[PDB]
Design an enzyme around this catalytic site. Structure first.
Site, PDB file in Angstrom:
ATOM      1  N   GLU A 403     -25.496 -62.841  55.801  1.00 49.18           N
ATOM      2  CA  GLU A 403     -24.132 -62.656  55.322  1.00 49.18           C
ATOM      3  C   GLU A 403     -23.191 -62.673  56.516  1.00 49.18           C
ATOM      4  OE1 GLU A 403     -20.983 -62.382  52.992  1.00 49.18           O
ATOM      5  OE2 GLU A 403     -21.190 -60.956  54.641  1.00 49.18           O
ATOM      6  N   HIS A 405     -19.642 -63.451  56.379  1.00 48.04           N
ATOM      7  CA  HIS A 405     -18.342 -63.730  55.780  1.00 48.04           C
ATOM      8  C   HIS A 405     -17.180 -63.431  56.719  1.00 48.04           C
ATOM      9  CE1 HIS A 405     -17.873 -59.430  55.340  1.00 48.04           C
ATOM     10  NE2 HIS A 405     -16.703 -59.591  54.750  1.00 48.04           N
ATOM     11  N   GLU A 448     -22.199 -65.970  51.139  1.00 45.05           N
ATOM     12  CA  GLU A 448     -20.938 -66.208  51.836  1.00 45.05           C
ATOM     13  C   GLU A 448     -21.109 -66.491  53.323  1.00 45.05           C
ATOM     14  OE1 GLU A 448     -18.602 -62.640  50.427  1.00 45.05           O
ATOM     15  OE2 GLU A 448     -17.350 -64.248  49.608  1.00 45.05           O
ATOM     16  N   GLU A 524     -21.834 -64.532  40.712  1.00 41.75           N
ATOM     17  CA  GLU A 524     -20.923 -63.414  40.517  1.00 41.75           C
ATOM     18  C   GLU A 524     -19.800 -63.841  39.586  1.00 41.75           C
ATOM     19  OE1 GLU A 524     -19.763 -61.680  44.448  1.00 41.75           O
ATOM     20  OE2 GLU A 524     -21.768 -62.391  44.976  1.00 41.75           O
ATOM     21  N   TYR A 525     -19.547 -63.029  38.565  1.00 42.03           N
ATOM     22  CA  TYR A 525     -18.418 -63.237  37.672  1.00 42.03           C
ATOM     23  C   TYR A 525     -18.089 -61.913  37.003  1.00 42.03           C
ATOM     24  CZ  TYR A 525     -21.029 -62.977  33.285  1.00 42.03           C
ATOM     25  OH  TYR A 525     -21.772 -62.544  32.216  1.00 42.03           O
ATOM     26  N   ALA A 526     -16.905 -61.860  36.389  1.00 39.70           N
ATOM     27  CA  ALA A 526     -16.445 -60.706  35.619  1.00 39.70           C
ATOM     28  C   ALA A 526     -16.410 -59.443  36.487  1.00 39.70           C
ATOM     29  CB  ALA A 526     -17.313 -60.501  34.372  1.00 39.70           C
ATOM     30  N   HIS A 527     -15.529 -59.490  37.484  1.00 32.60           N
ATOM     31  CA  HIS A 527     -15.376 -58.387  38.424  1.00 32.60           C
ATOM     32  C   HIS A 527     -14.971 -57.109  37.696  1.00 32.60           C
ATOM     33  CE1 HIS A 527     -14.244 -56.636  42.422  1.00 32.60           C
ATOM     34  NE2 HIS A 527     -15.210 -57.452  42.799  1.00 32.60           N
ATOM     35  N   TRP A 953      -8.395 -60.172  42.896  1.00 33.07           N
ATOM     36  CA  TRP A 953      -7.546 -60.560  44.015  1.00 33.07           C
ATOM     37  C   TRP A 953      -6.524 -61.624  43.634  1.00 33.07           C
ATOM     38  CZ3 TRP A 953     -12.817 -60.358  43.909  1.00 33.07           C
ATOM     39  CH2 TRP A 953     -13.500 -61.553  43.659  1.00 33.07           C
TER      40      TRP A 953
END
EC number: 3.2.1.23
Lengths: 978, 978
Positions: A403, A405, A448, A524-527, A953
């Protein structure tokens, strides 16, 4: 000498990406070194695996150059005793927080000095090999045994094993572990240092099983399987050595094989003399899946030709095939639909120390909410987690601990060949440790890190070593050559996000791009930050409609639950959206479609109920007999047809009458509600004999009817006070409200120092919605034949601009009812308001809230599919959602009737009721700072904005859930006990 | 302290595959750090690049633990001065020879201690970065500068750079280099230790060009090109920094570009602020190839916005495209035919130190013998080699220094992830160093290391980083997923070699296997050990017939030439088989087909000649005007038609009238010969008046004719003596010969201790061919009307079995001629004999050998296509080939007439003539031990076996070149001056 800290801490191995370990043993599946095969078969504890978890001496130093030499031989006098599996920032030594030079780390490197004094018995020292295993040490560490340096380790999330045979003496021994907070490995793990996993001692025989891995092959219809087991030994080869591999279903052996050592010819120089491949035929194997996690026990015995056992290892085996075919990810030949969630290793009150019971609780909760898959969020997990997912049934994506990022080119390290060895270690050791688990179905290259050539090289490495699993990687646009699956982060169902060089297409559009053949699964979805998960049903409609849309992983299991594992309301939404039975209504017939791929519905019962305005009229129960991916028709009995006014609702639910390994008896798994038939109320209110009396001063309008009084302030135009008998009913006047306390999705990443102006809260603040002032324009009071009519007009203005106009009529008739009609116009150029409703502070506090409306749990216009229409009665504390950062919460939509104390409100509205005002929720940073106010704050909205949730965001509230109509009308009748 | 040898030699970095370097700088193309762009453009020497080659102090120690500490500060008193670019085994310190525990090396590790005392001027120390470059150090080494440890290096065949800025002082400085003979890197380089390449000091500015690489893109017809140049800086970024890239053809600038730093957006975090990509348009670029090596000069200037130059680098650029399309390897859109040779870096008398003039001589020789490609045999070469191949024109395969052929599973290391970092360094640093050279067209993953997952990972890495070049790898069967080209070692044209799990198919069969689409180029074929290269014409017939058979690399350039670069006779064969003009004859017309892909034949002239038994009759010269891959018809003038008996031969040759960069004026490039027409001799010898007189004793038959006498031994049956006047002509009787001194291909890998029984020499020895005894069966002597007839019968027997029977007639007529007819029967079950001929030792030694027959050079039945039929006159020493290990040599096939001294032999035979007998050649191990015998040994064979050459470890003589007919007849007339 050469073991002094001056010599050892001179090359600064923690500031060198070319040195990730020193004297570290090879990676392998977990080993217990059983000396009797019956104990290996039953997974009984091994006498050769001795835990060193417990009390350790600990010291803290600002930098590694501050540790005294005497620590290498004797424990420091001021050293504090601790439990070693822990993070030392849970004890107040240096401050951990949530949040430059790729090889170099800061010179002020906090250093933890652990030490253990332990007995080694003579039998271990006489013969064999003794190793120490560190399941996890955050960042990097140097190891000493009895004052002699052993080795060095990095990669916090994978075990580090060291041979201690030459260093251990008889009786008491001392281990000294210097743990650095930062190393070059920190650039691949972009806190919370310490020895946060288990520490063990393992004793193996001189000749030993050094490795073994299993694979399963199937015919076209999965009716025959070949289990291939490759076994690697280390030590002195002999001609009498044999390896037996036996497969057990329960206490019944189903297959077995034996061979001496020496494999087939690999090339011109021959084959492996220290390896053996055994092939076992299994006829009609019980297949592993998440629905039915069938497991076998594989026992590997290293023995001699006469029959005496040298050592035994064992693993759980799941017969299952994972492959991508024609763009579809198939398990055992069936297309998967991934009901997944991302899960970090975070203990409720112990940091990153994960224990078995927490894992079991999490797995039970996930399965009970219809999750079938889990993503190891950005690093490999505790080895017990994979065993538990094998045993209960959960698809697992295993992720490398890579990672980066923070990098500004973002592939600066992962495109550099000088960083290829460090990344390759983190990928290869994970694959070598976890390749035997049936739950692990997908390898992930990390998180990331852009896309470099190192990613392609490691992807190809995994495909060569383990072709049985697909490889996924989000990075460089989620569709690079280093992934078998298009795995976007937070891509949307319908709206494209065309960023430069890394666009986030809509998933539907992403599927059909020219040349694209791969399946799409969102990593990843639906934070789920704060009050969120609006628009989840859109994602699942897309998943069910499109074959190559095969699901995704919801971000942050814990999150969907609080730290104490208390469930977020949105979890219910997820449970409803991921349920395995879909329902269709046609006349009086219910079509039930099973979404199970493998199992029959043998523990399923369909209960149904018909209700009129929450009053039950008919119910029944029908057993479910649905084949996997099949349909069952259920004809309903002749349903009641009432003549009384009201709306008929049909609710069906699926109950599991028997308990399972993960659920209790009576568990509800799926449900659905339909509107059956509505009868409009055409009966008129009987004419009253009394007439409310109106009195007009310049200050106020007063209306009297029996014991009831209403007082409207003429200066402000709002209903200021209400009297029953002599008790005032209001503390704050009933006034229009157009704002809400902003949510995490409203705020976005807007900061006080760094303002993001596209965020909803920023647009509302700039437009003056929170500072707009109501100005009375007209106020009329008239007496009709049988009522009193109050009409008012208000304008909200900010810096000369009129944002909202509200026109209201109040009709108070002889029955005491007060009908309020509200008409609001919103300027088209101001940002769309968060809500259009009324707000007041009731003077009295009541224990219960009753309402005919949607759902028991908090629900919102874009998150309400899981709510059901009925009569709900809750305590007042149940109407407030304790989000960590306070915001608008507790709203109930689709509400026809609300009863609180002596007050009843009727109409078609949303509401929330609490002891906290929207102002206090806005101005309070943490929920523990909230204080209950004098009375009850009631927010009755005619209209409410969606909450969003695609990410946190950027704005994510869809246009159909914004209040953009410009003009809005609602009505509400307020009455009291009578 | 920490710089003492006790501390530095404690972690044993040479016994750790996870440590391949310490404090080593990154890899990059060669840098000169020019401070004026005009010097960079003209490739003038740079003042910033200072060679340290010269006199160094050297000491030798048995092990690294034997070096005194005082060596770190002062040079040893007994130290010997040497030239640093050298191998210390060229000076008698430890014994190098040609010829277990993968991480560990023997504890007795010979250690060379080099030291240099040198001046650094103040200007280098004031500002900038000073680095030391070691172009090559065999195995591993530790570096000290003024007593302070700098770093550690491995991978002998690639440069190791170290930053010396902090270690250098004013005036005198001392460098101490400890070089170990073995390390873990030795397991990937499976002698000859030392600093065998150049050592340099490079000074760069504080802000500097840290990297740059160029790529060329073309349209469909190569009429437009885009040169993309990526430039990476290191140091402190400023807004006024600019990079200019200019392209020059000679002194004429053709393109230029300028930009500030900061690349395009790569991902969500942005792009590289320290990188710039410049695109230059070149219209109608002159394309690079081996035929026409067009080069441009690329100059990269790092300067400021106002215009002052900071530093300049430069490279040579070749516009050319390499790709595989539809199974064919194309350069600039044309299918390549690789006339390649494998070449090691071996100096004639300096070991592994390669200098410029040796490289230029080798390139000139290769181009003069029609080679267009070279394979860097198993490691990267000196960087000057690639520049020379760019400038003269040679396709280059660049090979990683990975070679693990000693491993018993043979992929034990290359399938182990613990060895992935070490292999990845050797691949990535080579690609980073050599990616800008136009001559390099293919990357090779290494040699003979099996096939592991590391190979696939590194193959994918290269394809990601450099898609402009194909990647090849022989290993795991030469057709794995880690290669774009099927690249077998020593696969045969027609015969399969189906080894287990690594079959060597015939190349024709290999091409058409189910699913196979790739081109085939042999990385090694036609093993040239000793008297070899038989069957080369078969390989080139296959190459020209099959489109996807695109050539190969002949093993061991030096070998095809001796160590002093003297050419092997087989080199001529190769030159003929690889020539770029193919010739066809039809009546009186010659069709000339050009095999050039790009160039017109503008320096080509066709000379032709017609000869009768070596006597020229007509000749002419025709200019060649042939398009690439085109044809030219040349009608011949009316050819002579002699009435005299003899055979007409037409010879054509292609001459280059003008000199080139690689050839002198008059160079012969191609040639061909045809038989035109034969007139049979029907004229009878005029009847003689004298009759030879026969005298018969029990011991001998004596025949007298004038001054000539022939004496046949009646006990043995062989012609024992010949007299002219009173001088005896023979020293050894003329006797049948069926054996030859075995060749390297006859011996194979058969050893005295380890006998291989399938080898030809072993089969001949077991059958008793070398020990067979001739036994006379019949002997008759008669006088005819005009002659004397001697008839003899001999049987060769071994252990009771008759291997050969020879029946001979001798007819001596009145003209002095002796006709000998020989009829031989060979037992079908004995191995086929190496030859069937006659052997004698002539008493006289003559200066010259004259013969009407094939070729000036030694030629054999399976290697004779390059020989021409004519009258040849050579010195006797030219008839012997000085092979290092003596064997049968110097044979001339297709010979009709042989003249030596006063003796003439006529017929149709092969012969060799020398001062060494076959027995002496067999029993002499090295050629310097040979001694000339009293007279001349003549071997006249009616029939001779092929020599083979496909490999040297198995029989390789094709069945059409074995003597399997069972019965054989020949005739030879022996006459003298008269």
């Amino acid at each position: 000498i050469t073991d002094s800290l001056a010599v050892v801490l001179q090359r600064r191995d923690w500031e060198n990406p070319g040195v990730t370990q020193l004297n570290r043993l090879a990676a392998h599946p977990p080993f217990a070194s059983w000396r009797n095969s019956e104990e290996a078969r039953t997974d009984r504890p091994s006498q050769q695996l001795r835990s060193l978890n417990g009390e350790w001496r600990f010291a803290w130093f600002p930098a590694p150059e501050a540790v005294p030499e005497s620590w290498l031989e004797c424990d420091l006098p001021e050293a504090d005793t601790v439990v070693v599996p822990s993070n030392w920032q849970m004890h107040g030594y240096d401050a951990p927080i949530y949040t430059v030079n790729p090889p170099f780390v800061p010179t002020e490197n906090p250093t933890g000095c652990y030490s253990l004094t332990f007995n080694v018995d003579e039998s271990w020292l006489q013969e064999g090999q003794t190793r120490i295993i560190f399941d996890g040490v955050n960042s990097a560490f140097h190891l000493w045994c009895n004052g002699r340096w052993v080795g060095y380790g990095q990669d916090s999330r994978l075990p580090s094993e060291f041979d201690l045979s030459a260093f251990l003496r008889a009786g008491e021994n001392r281990l000294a572990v210097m743990v650095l907070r930062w190393s070059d490995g920190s650039y691949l793990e972009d806190r919370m240092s310490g020895i946060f996993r288990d520490v063990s001692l393992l004793h193996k025989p001189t000749t030993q099983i050094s490795d073994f891995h299993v694979a399963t092959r199937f015919n076209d219809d999965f009716s025959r399987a070949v289990l291939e087991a490759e076994v690697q030994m280390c030590g002195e080869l002999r001609d009498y050595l044999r390896v037996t591999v036996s497969l057990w279903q329960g206490e019944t052996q189903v297959a077995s094989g034996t061979a001496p050592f020496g494999g087939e010819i690999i090339d011109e120089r021959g084959g492996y003399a220290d390896r053996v491949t055994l092939r076992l035929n299994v006829e009609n194997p019980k297949l592993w899946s998440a629905e039915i996690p069938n497991l076998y026990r594989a026992v590997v015995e290293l023995h001699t030709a006469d029959g005496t056992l040298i050592e035994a290892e064992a693993c759980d085996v799941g017969f299952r095939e994972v492959r991508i075919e024609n763009g579809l990810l198939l398990l055992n030949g069936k297309p998967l639909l991934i009901r997944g969630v991302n899960r970090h290793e975070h203990h409720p009150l112990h940091g990153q120390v994960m224990d078995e019971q927490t894992m079991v609780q999490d797995i039970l909760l996930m399965k009970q909410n219809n999750f079938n898959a889990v993503r190891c969020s950005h690093y490999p997990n505790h080895p017990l987690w994979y065993t538990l997912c094998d045993r209960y049934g959960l698809y697992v994506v295993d992720e490398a601990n890579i990672e980066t990022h923070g990098m500004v080119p973002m592939n600066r390290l992962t495109d550099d060949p000088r960083w290829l060895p460090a990344m390759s270690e983190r990928v290869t050791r994970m694959v070598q440790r976890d390749r035997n688990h049936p739950s692990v179905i997908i390898w992930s290259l990390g998180n990331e890190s852009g896309h470099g050539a190192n990613h392609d090289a490691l992807y190809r490495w995994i495909k060569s070593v383990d072709p049985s699993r697909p490889v996924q990687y989000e990075g460089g646009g989620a569709d690079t050559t280093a992934t078998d699956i298009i795995c976007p982060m937070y891509a949307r169902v319908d709206e494209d996000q065309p960023f430069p060089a890394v666009p986030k297409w809509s998933i539907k559009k992403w599927l059909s791009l020219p040349g694209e053949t791969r399946p799409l699964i969102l990593c990843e979805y639906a934070h789920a930050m704060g009050n969120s998960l609006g628009g989840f049903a859109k994602y699942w409609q897309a998943f069910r409609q499109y074959p190559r849309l095969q699901g995704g992983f919801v971000w942050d299991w814990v999150g969907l639950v609080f730290a104490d594992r208390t469930p977020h309301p949105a979890l219910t939404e997820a449970k409803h959206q991921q349920q395995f039975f879909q329902f269709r209504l046609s006349g009086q017939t219910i079509e039930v479609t099973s979404e199970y791929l493998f199992r029959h519905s043998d523990n399923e019962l369909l209960h149904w109920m018909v209700a009129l305005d929450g009053k039950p009229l008919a119910s029944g129960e029908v057993p479910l007999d649905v084949a996997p991916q099949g349909k069952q028709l259920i004809e309903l009995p002749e349903l009641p047809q009432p003549e009384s006014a009201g709306q008929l609702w049909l609710t069906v639910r699926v109950v599991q009458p028997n308990a399972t390994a993960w659920s209790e008896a009576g568990h509800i798994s799926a449900w659905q509600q339909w509107r059956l038939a509505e009868n409009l109320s055409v009966t008129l209110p009987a004419a009253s004999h009394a007439i409310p009396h109106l009195t007009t001063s310049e200050m106020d309008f007063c209306i009297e009817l029996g014991n009831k009084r209403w007082q409207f302030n003429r200066q402000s135009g709002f209903l200021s006070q209400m009297w029953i008998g002599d008790k005032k009913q209001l503390l704050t006047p009933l006034r229009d409200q157009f704002t809400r306390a902003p949510l995490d999705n409203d705020i976005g990443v807007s900061e006080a120092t760094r303002i993001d102006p596209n965020a909803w809260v920023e647009r509302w603040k700039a437009a003056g919605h929170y500072q707009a002032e109501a100005a009375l324009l007209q106020c009329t009071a008239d007496t009709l034949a049988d009522a009193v009519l109050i009409t008012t007009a208000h304008a909200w203005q900010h810096q000369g601009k009129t944002l909202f106009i509200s026109r209201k009529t109040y009709r108070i008739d002889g029955s005491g009812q007060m009908a309020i009609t509200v008409d609001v116009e919103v300027a088209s150029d101001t940002p769309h308001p968060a809500r259009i409703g009324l707000n007041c502070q009731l003077a009295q506090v009541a224990e219960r809230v009753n309402w005919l409306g949607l759902g028991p749990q908090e629900n919102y216009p874009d998150r309400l599919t899981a709510a059901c229409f009925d009569r709900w009665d809750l305590p007042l504390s149940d109407m407030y959602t304790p989000y960590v950062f306070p915001s608008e919460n507790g709203l109930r939509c689709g509400t026809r009737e609300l009863n609180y104390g002596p007050h009843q409100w009727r109409g078609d509205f949303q509401f929330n009721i609490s002891r906290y005002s929207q102002q206090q929720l806005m101005e309070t940073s943490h929920r523990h700072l909230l204080h209950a106010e004098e009375g009850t704050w009631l927010n009755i909205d005619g209209f409410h904005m969606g909450i969003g949730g695609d990410d946190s965001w950027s704005p994510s509230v869809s246009a159909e859930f914004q209040l953009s109509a410009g003009r809005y009308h609602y009505q509400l009748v307020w009455c009291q006990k009578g």
